[PDB]
Amino acid sequence: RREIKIEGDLVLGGLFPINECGRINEDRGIQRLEAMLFAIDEINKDDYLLPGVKLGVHILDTCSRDTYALEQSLEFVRASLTKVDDGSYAIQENIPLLIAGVIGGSYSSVSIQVANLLRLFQIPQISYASTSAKLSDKSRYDYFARTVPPDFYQAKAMAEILRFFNWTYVSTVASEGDYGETGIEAFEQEARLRNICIATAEKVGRSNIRKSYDSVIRELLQKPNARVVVLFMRSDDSRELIAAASRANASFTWVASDGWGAQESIIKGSEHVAYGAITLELASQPVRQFDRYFQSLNPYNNHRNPWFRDFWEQKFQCSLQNKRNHRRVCDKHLAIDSSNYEQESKIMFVVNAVYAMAHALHKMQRTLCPNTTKLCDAMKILDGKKLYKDYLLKINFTAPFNPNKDADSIVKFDTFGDGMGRYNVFNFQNVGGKYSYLKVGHWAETLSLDVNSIHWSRNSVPTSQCSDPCAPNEMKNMQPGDVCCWICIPCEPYE
């Protein structure tokens, strides 16, 4: 098992989808991990926020799998269990560092398992990308918080997106799991609220053979009238479904979600099959300081990561001197600046999370041990319950880069420990052949799309809507075998 363990006065837990158990995640995982460690270094180098407290880290692979993430969550937990616990001469083995607070994120299912295992140890947990509405509940997940808004706000944004184009008749597909099911249920409720019908609902499983996805594709083609499919999937399932839909001679205008996000590697090599896609993302503002820090990184100056070598040899497809015969050997001048490095949108969220935790600790330090800037007897024992309930949940500090224009500088949690609901909408339009996303609008509660800048798939507004609003006042509506939508029959003038 590969880990990161940097010791200090206090240590934060690190949960990321570094691997996909499979292959290394290139954007979601490693950029977020580097950002977290960068913020940790900034904390351990500054002088106004925990100056005398050196903040360490313990970061572990999740593989986007419940059982595996649970095993490294148990690795986090071992520290509190070993406290009550001998040896003939000296028994060290591994010394599990006492985690002050776990910055645990990635998908919703992993975060829910981590919250379940950490609630029993009253260890605070801050997420950065998990957005399931289930985690808003405090009955089972009281000690869970996150700087991202819950799922049902995103579902409401999706329903508004649908009703802006009058897409009354749409299909939808979600990933079989807690996140996909919960979010798609919320979005379907919003759709029935806005009188926006649905065609089909399909589930593919968090991990499945390439038999479910093509069946879902055939189901989506079983209703040609519905040119719009609402996709609410996790990132890996989105990748698999896009690959499957490209396998068949098919295309659509995919209404995507946060799991799709502004991700490029998900659609890698498959621009056409998802060209008119509409994707929502939790709006943010990237950090230039992290940009320069991350670009300054090299495998020679980065021994802090067990994966950075494999990350480099995957992203650039060139092997180091380890083998030198698989594909190629990296030149000595390889870099990141001009290369295809678009830092993930959800980086600053990650960073904010850590700082929130840091500030909480700072406030707790200013309360438990205000006489000195030390981890004295009052503070050397972590009061996770009190830390979470009195410092974490109530944290009101300006954004780390309020010098940059940010009306939403205040990181203010709701009563349930969630962030502001403020989203960006993207379409995968063409710019230069190797085209990418760019912002087509923003949303707080009222849409701000721009139809002109959409540049749709079939060079035209998708008319995924079914026949017409039947207007029974002049022609009544009937559903012979078409339960979804209606067909009009001109009512008699004498009836």
Ligand X SMILES: N[C@@H](CCC(=O)O)C(=O)O
Ligand Y SMILES: *[C@@H]1O[C@H](CO)[C@@H](O[C@@H]2O[C@H](CO)[C@@H](O)[C@H](O)[C@H]2NC(C)=O)[C@H](O)[C@H]1NC(C)=O
Give, to the nearest 10 degrees, the angle between helix 108-119 and helix 66-84: 20
397 and 85 in contact (C-beta within 8 Å)?
no
Look at strands 55-61 and 3-6 and give their pairing.
antiparallel
If one asks whether residue 258 binds ligand X (CB under 6 A), the answer comes out as yes
Is 87 or 490 the residue whose CB approaches its own copies more closely?
A: 87
If one asks whether residue 284 binds ligand X (CB under 6 A), the answer comes out as no
Report the residue from 23, 47, 48, 91 that binds its own copies according to the rule CB under 8 A: 91
Is 164 or 435 the residue whose CB approaches ligand Y more closely?
A: 164
440 and 454 in contact (C-beta within 8 Å)?
yes
- What residue 132 binds from its own copies, ligand Y, ligand X, none (CB within 5 to 8 A, per partner kind)? ligand X
| Separation of alpha carbons 18 and 153, rounded Å | 28
**Residues near ligand Y (CB under 6 A), total:** 2
| Separation of alpha carbons 74 and 68, rounded Å | 10
Please, what is the minimum distance in Å from the beta carbon of residue 74 to its own copies? 6
Q: For 83, list phi and psi in degrees, rounded to 5.
A: -65, -40
| Separation of alpha carbons 301 and 316, rounded Å | 17
CA dist 306 to 25, 34, 218, 242, 303, Å?
14, 12, 42, 30, 7
Q: For 170, list phi and psi in degrees, rounded to 5.
A: -135, 155
User: Taking contact as CB under 6 A, which single stretch among the options 8-16, 126-134, 223-231, 447-455 is the one that binds ligand X?
Assistant: 126-134
Is 149 or 462 the residue whose CB approaches ligand Y more closely?
A: 462
Which two tokens mark 462? Answer: 């998708």
DSSP states of 94-116: -----EEEEEE-SSHHHHHHHHH
Is 223 or 346 the residue whose CB approaches ligand X more closely?
A: 346
232 and 175 in contact (C-beta within 8 Å)?
yes
If one asks whether residue 235 binds ligand X (CB under 6 A), the answer comes out as yes
- What residue 150 binds from ligand Y, its own copies, ligand X, none (CB within 5 to 8 A, per partner kind)? none
If one asks whether residue 444 binds its own copies (CB under 8 A), the answer comes out as no
The single residue listed with the structure tokens 């205008």 is 253
Is 168 or 319 the residue whose CB approaches ligand Y more closely?
A: 168
Which two tokens mark 359? Answer: 């500030």
Is 190 or 258 the residue whose CB approaches ligand X more closely?
A: 258
Please, what is the minimum distance in Å from the beta carbon of residue 91 to its own copies? 4
- What residue 140 binds from its own copies, ligand Y, ligand X, none (CB within 5 to 8 A, per partner kind)? its own copies
**Residues near its own copies (CB under 8 A), total:** 24
Q: Is 179 annotated as a binding residue?
A: yes
If one asks whether residue 362 binds ligand X (CB under 6 A), the answer comes out as no
Sheet holding 99-104, edge to edge: 3-6, 55-61, 10-16, 99-104, 125-127, 144-146
Q: Is 380 annotated as a binding residue?
A: no
State the Cα angle at 417 between 77 and 399, rounded to 5°. Answer: 105
Is 338 or 446 the residue whose CB approaches ligand Y more closely?
A: 446
Which two tokens mark 122? Answer: 């009253």
DSSP H stretches of helix in 265-329:
288-295, 308-315
62 and 110 in contact (C-beta within 8 Å)?
yes
Which two tokens mark 217? Answer: 């594709």
User: Taking contact as CB under 6 A, which single stretch among the options 256-264, 317-325, 425-433, 440-448 is the one that binds ligand X?
Assistant: 256-264
If one asks whether residue 25 binds ligand X (CB under 6 A), the answer comes out as no
Which two tokens mark 354? Answer: 């850590």
Which residues 149-188 are close enough to bind ligand Y by CB under 6 A? 165-166
Is 269 or 469 the residue whose CB approaches ligand Y more closely?
A: 469
User: Taking contact as CB under 8 A, which single stretch among the options 74-82, 167-175, 289-297, 446-454 is the one that binds its own copies?
Assistant: 74-82
Closest CA to 235 of 53, 452, 433, 28: 28
Closest CA to 175 of 152, 129, 218, 206: 206
- In 3-state terms, what secondary structure has residue 487? strand
| Separation of alpha carbons 148 and 75, rounded Å | 26
Q: Is 159 annotated as a binding residue?
A: no
Please, what is the minimum distance in Å from the beta carbon of residue 379 to ligand X? 33
Please, what is the minimum distance in Å from the beta carbon of residue 83 to its own copies? 10
If one asks whether residue 453 binds ligand Y (CB under 6 A), the answer comes out as no
User: Taking contact as CB under 6 A, which single stretch among the options 124-132, 211-219, 296-304, 486-494 is the one that binds ligand X?
Assistant: 124-132
Q: For ligand Y, which residue has the nearest CB?
A: 166
Is 163 or 439 the residue whose CB approaches ligand Y more closely?
A: 163
If one asks whether residue 289 binds ligand Y (CB under 6 A), the answer comes out as no
Outline where DSSP puts E strands in 392-434. Answer: 423-427
Report the residue from 31, 106, 113, 465 that binds ligand X according to the rule CB under 6 A: 106
Q: Under the rule (CB under 6 A), what is the footprint of ligand X?
A: 28, 106-108, 129-132, 179, 234-235, 258-259, 261, 346
Residue numbers belonging to the annotated binding site for L-glutamate? 108, 129-131, 179, 258, 346
Q: Under the rule (CB under 6 A), what is the footprint of ligand Y?
A: 165-166
Q: Under the rule (CB under 8 A), what is the footprint of its own copies?
A: 70, 74-75, 77-78, 80-81, 84-94, 113, 116-117, 119-120, 140
